[PDB]
Design a protein around this ligand. Structure first.
Ligand SMILES: [Mg+2]
Ligand SMILES: [Mg+2]
Ligand SMILES: [Mg+2]
Ligand SMILES: [Mg+2]
Ligand SMILES: [Zn+2]
Ligand SMILES: [Zn+2]
Ligand SMILES: [Zn+2]
Ligand SMILES: [Zn+2]
Ligand SMILES: [Zn+2]
Lengths: 38, 34, 285, 447, 149, 55
RNA sequence: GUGCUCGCUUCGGCAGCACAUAUACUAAAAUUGGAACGAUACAGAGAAGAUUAGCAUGGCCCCUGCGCAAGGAUGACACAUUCGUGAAGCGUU
RNA sequence: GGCCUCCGAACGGUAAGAGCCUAGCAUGUAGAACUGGUUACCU
């Protein structure tokens, strides 16, 4: 029987969230010069 | 992991959406117009 | 919702009342808040509560409170000594945080029921650990902690005292110290090492008394059995040379093409094989 | 999900909890179910008695005394009635022992089951057996310097405060731990550590042995000094006084083994009568702390070196000091040792040098001998000379032993043995084959 | 050795990470770091460095060549094979990848493999020179019919 | 989510001008293929702006 | 535990029935390892020759601040000469 | 015929730091072992 635990309404935020950790998908294929121009 | 922090700016304001009325220029009129 | 659990924790009662907190505790490993579950396992029991978040269990495939494997009930260092160390996972700080994050997405994309990469490996087993795996529930593990007033001689709650009144464990024994992180990563785990020392003594694999000998000295035959049991067991291995049979002492000698096959039949067999519902015991010469 | 009537759940849960038998919930156990799921001893016997339903029979009530009127005061017990019935010495001891052990880890013990061997002998009593002879003449031969280290020793989890050998010949070796512990060792590279000693509150600072070799003295930062039986580990006597006691020596003279001489942080040096335990003779002349005390000639004189940068030499048991040596130049003398010939002193001055002072009546430091290949900014240390006075070995903060040629006055050899700073270095007085060192890393090494 | 070597590695290693974190990209920092670990034969670390660099900038063809090269130098044939496949899959237009990929397979002896690669390559309808190389490939063996086809 | 402000406005405008030119032109000018004069073209920008301030 | 069975039936005991149905981070403990902007010590503010005003940019750096405000040293962090190998591909004598 | 304002607080100044040494602060954990085996034939 699962019961949800009652939370104390005057309880402050318990724990600290601020911590920061560094930031994808495999790249999709791209499928897309003269000397003078250079 | 959602913080219990708040800010003044964030609070409710203009919770209603002003829909255009018929004389204001509801889309119904617009569709019909030449 | 709902924890991941040993059968041994959850309780010996089938009826159970179990409570839930949304973000109860940090997990002592990946150090995040996670849903926590308490329940009473039994009459004299302790109110266990989940110690680690569900993710890092799926990661190393373990109970949330015990951190013992689901199938084997073995500390992680053991079942890694049993198969594959190369799972790994960063211990170090911000890596741990990072790798946990990514692996949390990877798990999110799985069928859900599978301990990630390990399960691809996890099927192939039985080398030893099955034979050192624990069989029945072990309830001595949920007993209440040792009353620490009484262990100084004073405890003034009398019989009421829910704690336990008895002699504690001598801090001398290396099996005492037992960090959590440590038990998780499989470092210098005293328990796991003990089980390793126990693994070695298993009379089993060294064999090789003499060269080329494929002779199998089989004790504990019994007079119910036929040879055909033997052959239809042993054709898996290869080309038999022959089989000698003695039913007066109920010992059966066997001979195979190569010694390799005989070693095998030892291995596969030793203190494992039984047919005709009767144990078939094996020895060299 | 499931949607089971709550009340029935309670009925089954209590039924199981109380008696051990409850009808099992399953759906596909057989795909049809006929079976209970409890221990079942109760279930056959009790016919599925529900907690809510009245039990068919009642048994074994236990009484709790009650007064319910409430007219009385103090008197009244309500439902607060403390069961009349319910109000080991054998155990009372094991627990205590455990506690003691725990404390120690943060009472004396004996190491090894060897006890008394052959005729009936102290472990201390005889060595005879090791290659060479402990009784041995003073100069073994032309001396040697070691490369190879033989024993770690350990035991100590903290750097050894001090290391000393054994009166007469290096039969035993004894170490001081800052974990409040003292251990005896074979001194022959042998694994065994004899008998452990425990009884100090705080790290043990220094020790000394009975010239005969049966008694043993220790001084610690706990403001106490103890006299020990080297053969039992028995704390024979404890000497008081408010001041922390630094280096302590036992009078060397056969006539007066009894007298302790303790150097105090509080200027004074004090002679203690061992038998009375009473103070015999205070020496107040010194200003500042006292660091070390030796005896330049046995019985007659000793040299005290003090927190103030001076040496005080005295006759024995007489308070005044005949010779006082100070030079504005010299930084300090934390450790001073005396040559086996009784002719030279060697101080490890803070200033990063070794100073030789003539043992001979003229206590004048000599320019000819000096040592400065090593650095101790400000560390206590031991300086020793290879028997035969061939070499001098200093132990330093950096951890490298410095071996000098006395005759030639030059760093002949140097080792980087130890990864933490090293203090006392002892050359085995009988064997030329080795020296013994200790230092913060907590290990005793043999070179 | 045992500890003395170790400290050196921390100073270098830490420095490499600092450089990367400061500039983020500028993949000469990435590459130098990879090279150093390769030289110490810590190639599992090296692999992770290369993968991290790829996460930053997967289009950079020098990076990929250094990565594949590293695997080949350490005889890690199958790693190299994987890598080559990825390179041509994500950056098909880069002809350098194709030329190296076929060369590697040829050296390994896997003519069939190389043929397969070239057939993939040709699907991109590349450049006159690529076709010539495919034909020449065939002509290093008799295989005249193949060439004509 | 810092908010534009009087202290930050001049810095803001020049920041997003350097970005405007950078994105536009390096997505507009290219075929250098390696790095095309980004530091340099921007230095030409500041140079020109100073020159117009000095007339 | 309270009440009731024209309960056995005296006023003691016993029986039946009704009502009443699962507390609790159990410890009044034991252990276990990051921070004080303390003193001490060394050293000592970005930009150009110096002295200084500042807004910014970037985030495995924070702090004060209710704050999408503003401060924290601009908070800190930010270090002209002259070519040739080796391999591969393509075309040619 | 009348007509009588205000009223106070915050930082922007005493360095920024690196180091060493020493109370302080959180946890109230999880887990603690294991047994039983035979030889017999022709030259
Ligand atoms: Mg200023
Ligand atoms: Mg600012
Ligand atoms: Mg700034
Ligand atoms: Mg300012
Ligand atoms: Zn975790
Ligand atoms: Zn568990
Ligand atoms: Zn108790
Ligand atoms: Zn006299
Ligand atoms: Zn005088």
């Amino acid at each position: 029987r699962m019961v949800e635990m009652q939370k104390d309404p005057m309880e402050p935020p318990r724990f600290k969230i601020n911590k920061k950790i560094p930031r994808e998908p495999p790249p999709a294929p791209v499928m897309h010069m003269t000397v003078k121009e250079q | 992991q959602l913080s219990k922090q708040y800010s003044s700016r964030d609070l409710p304001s203009h919770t209603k959406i002003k829909y255009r009325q018929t004389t204001q220029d509801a889309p119904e009129e617009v569709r019909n117009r030449d | 919702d709902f924890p991941i659990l040993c059968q041994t924790c959850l309780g010996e009662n089938p009826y159970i009342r179990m409570t839930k907190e949304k973000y109860g505790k940090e997990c002592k490993i990946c150090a995040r808040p996670f849903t926590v579950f308490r329940w009473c396992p039994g009459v004299r029991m302790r109110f266990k509560k989940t110690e680690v978040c569900q993710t890092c269990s799926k990661l190393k495939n373990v109970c949330q409170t015990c951190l013992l494997d689901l199938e084997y009930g073995l500390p992680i260092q053991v079942r890694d000594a049993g198969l594959s160390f190369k799972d790994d996972m960063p211990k170090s700080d911000v890596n741990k945080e990072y790798y946990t994050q990514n692996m949390e997405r990877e798990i999110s994309n799985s069928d859900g029921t599978r301990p990630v990469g390990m399960l691809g490996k996890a099927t192939s087993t039985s080398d030893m650990l099955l034979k050192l795996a624990r069989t029945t529930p072990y309830y001595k593990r949920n007993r209440p902690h040792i009353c620490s007033f009484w262990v100084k001689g004073e405890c003034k709650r009398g019989e009421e005292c829910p704690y336990r009144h008895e002699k504690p464990t001598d801090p001398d024994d290396p099996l005492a110290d037992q960090n959590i992180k440590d038990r998780y990563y499989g470092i210098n785990d005293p328990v796991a090492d003990k089980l390793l020392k126990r693994a070695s003594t298993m009379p089993r694999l060294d064999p090789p008394e003499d060269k080329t000998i494929t002779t199998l000295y089989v004790g504990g035959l019994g007079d119910t059995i036929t040879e055909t049991d033997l052959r239809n067991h042993f054709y898996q291995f290869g080309e038999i040379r022959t089989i000698t049979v003695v039913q007066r002492q109920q010992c059966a000698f066997i001979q195979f093409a190569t010694r390799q096959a005989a070693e095998v039949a030892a291995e596969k067999s030793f203190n494992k094989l039984i047919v005709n519902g009767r144990r078939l015991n094996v020895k060299w010469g | 999900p499931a949607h089971i009537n709550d009340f029935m759940f309670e009925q089954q849960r209590r039924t199981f909890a109380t008696y051990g038998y409850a009808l099992d919930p399953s759906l596909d156990n057989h795909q049809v179910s006929a079976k209970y799921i409890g221990s079942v001893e109760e279930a056959e016997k009790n016919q599925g008695l529900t907690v809510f339903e009245t039990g068919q029979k009642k048994t074994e009530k236990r009484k709790k005394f009650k007064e319910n009127d409430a007219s009385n005061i103090d008197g009244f017990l309500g439902p607060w009635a403390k069961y009349v019935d319910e109000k080991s010495e054998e155990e009372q001891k094991e627990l205590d022992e455990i506690t003691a052990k725990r404390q120690k880890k943060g009472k004396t013990i004996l190491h090894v089951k060897e006890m008394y061997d052959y005729q009936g002998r102290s472990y201390l009593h005889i060595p005879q057996d090791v290659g060479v002879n402990l009784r041995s003449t003073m100069p073994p031969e032309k001396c040697y310097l070691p490369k190879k280290q033989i024993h770690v020793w350990s035991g100590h989890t903290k750097g050894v405060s001090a290391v000393r050998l054994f009166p007469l010949s290096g039969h035993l070796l004894l170490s001081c731990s800052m974990d409040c512990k003292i251990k005896l060792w074979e001194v022959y590279g042998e694994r065994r550590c004899l008998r452990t000693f425990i009884g100090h509150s705080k790290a043990v600072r220094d020790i000394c042995f009975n010239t005969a070799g049966t008694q043993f003295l220790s001084a610690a930062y706990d403001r106490y000094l103890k006299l020990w039986d080297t053969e039992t580990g028995q704390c024979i006597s404890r000497f008081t006084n408010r001041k922390v006691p630094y280096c302590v020596k036992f009078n060397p003279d056969e006539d007066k083994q009894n007298l302790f001489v303790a150097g105090m942080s509080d200027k004074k040096i004090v002679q203690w009568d061992i038998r009375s335990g009473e103070i015999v003779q205070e020496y107040d002349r010194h200003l500042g702390a006292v660091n070390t005390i030796v005896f330049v000639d046995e019985n007659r004189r000793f040299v005290s070196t003090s927190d103030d940068k001076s040496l005080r030499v005295w006759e024995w048991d007489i308070p005044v000091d005949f010779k006082y040596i100070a030079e504005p130049s010299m930084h300090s003398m934390p450790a001073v040792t005396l040559s086996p010939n009784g002719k030279w002193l060697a101080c490890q001055s803070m200033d990063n040098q070794i100073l030789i002072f003539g043992a001979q009546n003229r206590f004048r430091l000599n320019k000819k001998k000096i040592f400065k290949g090593h650095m101790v900014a400000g560390y206590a240390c031991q300086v020793d000379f290879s028997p035969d006075m061939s070499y001098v070995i200093s132990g330093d903060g950096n951890g490298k032993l410095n071996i000098w040629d006395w005759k030639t006055t030059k760093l002949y050899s140097r080792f980087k043995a130890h990864d933490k700073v090293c203090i006392g270095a002892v050359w085995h007085p009988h064997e030329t084959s080795k020296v013994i060192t200790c230092g913060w890393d907590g290990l005793i090494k043999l070179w | 050795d045992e500890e003395e070597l170790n400290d050196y590695k921390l100073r270098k290693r830490k420095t490499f990470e600092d450089n990367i974190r400061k500039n983020r990209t500028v993949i000469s920092n990435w590459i130098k770091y990879a090279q150093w670990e390769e030289s110490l034969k810590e190639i599992q670390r090296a692999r992770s460095i290369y993968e991290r660099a790829l996460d930053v900038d997967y289009r950079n063809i020098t990076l990929w060549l250094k990565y594949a090269e590293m695997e080949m130098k350490n005889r890690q044939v199958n790693h190299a094979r994987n890598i080559w496949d990825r390179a041509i899959t994500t950056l098909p237009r880069v002809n350098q990848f194709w030329y190296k990929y076929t060369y590697m397979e040829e050296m390994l002896g896997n003519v069939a493999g190389a043929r397969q690669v070239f057939e993939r390559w040709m699907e991109w309808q590349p450049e006159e020179q690529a076709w010539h190389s495919y034909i020449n490939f065939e002509l290093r063996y008799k295989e005249v019919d193949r060439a004509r086809t | 989510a810092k908010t534009v402000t009087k202290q930050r406005v001049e810095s803001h405008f020049d920041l997003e001008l350097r970005a405007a030119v950078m994105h536009d032109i390096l997505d507009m000018m290219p075929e250098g293929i390696k790095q095309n004069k980004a530091r340099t073209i921007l230095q030409h920008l500041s140079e020109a702006w100073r020159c117009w301030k000095a007339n």
